[model samples]
Structures are given as C-alpha cells and as structure tokens.
Target: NNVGPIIRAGDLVEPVIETAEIDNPGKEITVEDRRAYVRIAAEGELILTRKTLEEQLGRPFNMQELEINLASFAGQIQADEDQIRFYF
Candidate 1:
C-alpha cells in the first residue's frame, strides 16, 4: 500500500490544484469545497509547479502567486524558485 506522509493544501484555485495533484503520481485525492475556500488532500507529497498551474489556468503564473490564493495548508512545504511542494 502507499503508506506515505499525508499532505494537503487549501486555496481558491481548487480545480487547478486538483488537476495538478491528480496528474502527479500519488494516492487518490480528496477535495472539499467550502464555498469560500477549497481544501485538497492527498496521501504523500502534493506538487504545485508554475508550469502545471500555468497550463491549468491557461495563462502565465508564478509559484509565489499561489500565496495569495492560499488560505492555509498542512505538512512541510518545500519551495524553490519555480515549484512549491507540500509533504511531511
């Protein structure tokens, strides 16, 4: 079984993040929409890349731009110049 660390992130860009999580190799994702916000959950690391977000948004996006939409998140976050990852 895929017994890994639990990871999750919340933001207004729920659908975009959902697609990125699903595209990555991981366990099934669970999404909760709370009208004002959306929470995305997955077992293990959740990847968020500028390339992926841009593709989903159909426009240019910055990794830092996600911070604006981010309501909150769990797990350890590792970020670089181009990508941001949430994991234990």
Candidate 2:
C-alpha cells in the first residue's frame, strides 16, 4: 500500500509537492491532482524537509504553519522541527 501526503490545492502546496519528490528519490511516486486536493503517494517512507519547503516558498516555513497546506495525510507521522515523515 502507498503512504504519503494529501495536500490541499494552493500556491503553498504546489512547491510542497516537489519537496516530497525531492526527498524520496528512487521510490515510486504517484501524484493525483484533482483540482480540489493533491495526493503524493509513495511506498516505504515519504519525508519532507523544512529546508526544502522553505526554499520552495522563498521564505521561512514552520511546521505549525502546515495547518493550511497539509489537508490530509496517510499512515503514521513524525512531527519534528526540521522534517515531517509519513510511513506505515
């Protein structure tokens, strides 16, 4: 089964999607942009880094500010300052 992030469609999430891909290299990634919501699924683990996200946004990004962007998520999560991880 695939496990990852289901992000709300918005400017913030556009680059956030790229963050998932950048961190999870070599893993098979699937993205479904449904206009309403976007899903980034991959096997094993899907980890997103704050450094990567901040660069994408061209500003500082805090996990607390994730309320609006991460519309949904699958599997368990690791909530940390530098990284957020989703895995089975």
Candidate 3:
C-alpha cells in the first residue's frame, strides 16, 4: 500500500514531516510540497506512532487528534491509541 499524509499548512506541518521520516526510516519517501499543503508518500505503507510523534512534538498526542492535521491520507487506515497505520 502506497500511503502517507496530505498535510495542510499549519503548525502540524514540520512535525508531520519529521514524524514520517522517523517512523519510516530507511524507506524511500516521496514528498510534494505544494504551497497550500504537502503530500508525503512512501512506496509501501506509512505508519505514524504516537510515541514517536509525542517525541517529535514534545507533548502527548491524542491519536484521534490527527484528523486536524490529516488533511487527507492515501490507502486505508487502522488507528489505535498508540499508533496509526495506513495500508492497502
């Protein structure tokens, strides 16, 4: 599954980029920086872990809150309190 986030312009942008890279280290991620929003994609799948995200943001992440920054995402998703996954 080719999956990632379509992050909108806002405070969430930078952190999202960092989180994506951290969670998918060693993966070939593709990014399209549109002025209004940014698209981040990995060839297989994308995962964003709450622990990793909190480390990036320096605050705890209420997983569901991602919907705010998550303008859109590719593929299907499975969200838990600790992580969020996107796959075919």
Candidate 4:
C-alpha cells in the first residue's frame, strides 16, 4: 500500500494546502483528512509552492511555517526558495 510520496500537515493550513492544487500532470492526487492532520499523497512526485499556499491562505505565507505543521512524510524532499517538492 505504501507507494509514492505522501505529505502530511496539521489542520492550521489544511484548507489552503488541500485546495491549492499542485501541477501534477498524469498523476492522481489523494487527500485524507484525519482529525489531527491531513495527508496529501501522489504517485512518483508531489509539489507544493509558497505562492499557491499564500494564494489560498489569502495572506502572506512562508514555506518555513509549514515545517511546524508537518506531521510526517514519505520520499526525498527538495525545499527551495519557493517550492517544497517530494520525489522518489
């Protein structure tokens, strides 16, 4: 059952992160809303950007802020100046 990349976060930014779509061409995205946290999963690669988060949040948002809410994850993470990506 464990396949591909999975990213989880707390409820504080759930709505924003969940709603802000990732540019996943040819990948299926799934989301699970646990009482304490939310999980977003996808095959191969998953991407989340600060720009998208800020847009959905309707305010200034920093990528570092997400670290606080990060419950768990799977795969290698590449956190750049603007995006946080998970891959093989």
Best candidate, TM-score-wise?
Answer: 2
Ranking by TM-score: 2, 3, 4, 1
**For model 1, which pairs clash?**
none
In model 4, where is the ten-residue run with the lowest total lDDT? Answer: 1-10
lDDT of 2: 0.82
Choose 1 or 2, whichever is better by TM-score. Answer: 2
Worst 10-residue lDDT window, candidate 3? 60-69
**lDDT score, residue 81, model 1?**
66
**lDDT tens digits, residue span 1-88, model 1:** 1211222343325545555575566467666666566666666666767776777777777766775556677677788867777786
Model 1 TM: 0.74
Model 4: how far residue 58 lies from native, Å: 0.3
The lDDT values for all models are 0.61, 0.82, 0.82, 0.63
The per-residue C-alpha lDDT of model 2 at residue 49 equals: 89
Steric overlap count per candidate: 0, 0, 0, 0
TM-scores of all predicted structures: 0.74, 0.89, 0.88, 0.75
lDDT per residue for candidate 3 within 40-72, as digits (tens), equals 888778888888888888987878777677789
Backbone-clash count (model 1): 0
Q: What is the lDDT of residue 81 in candidate 2?
A: 88
**lDDT score, candidate 2, position 74:** 85
lDDT against true structure, model 4: 0.63
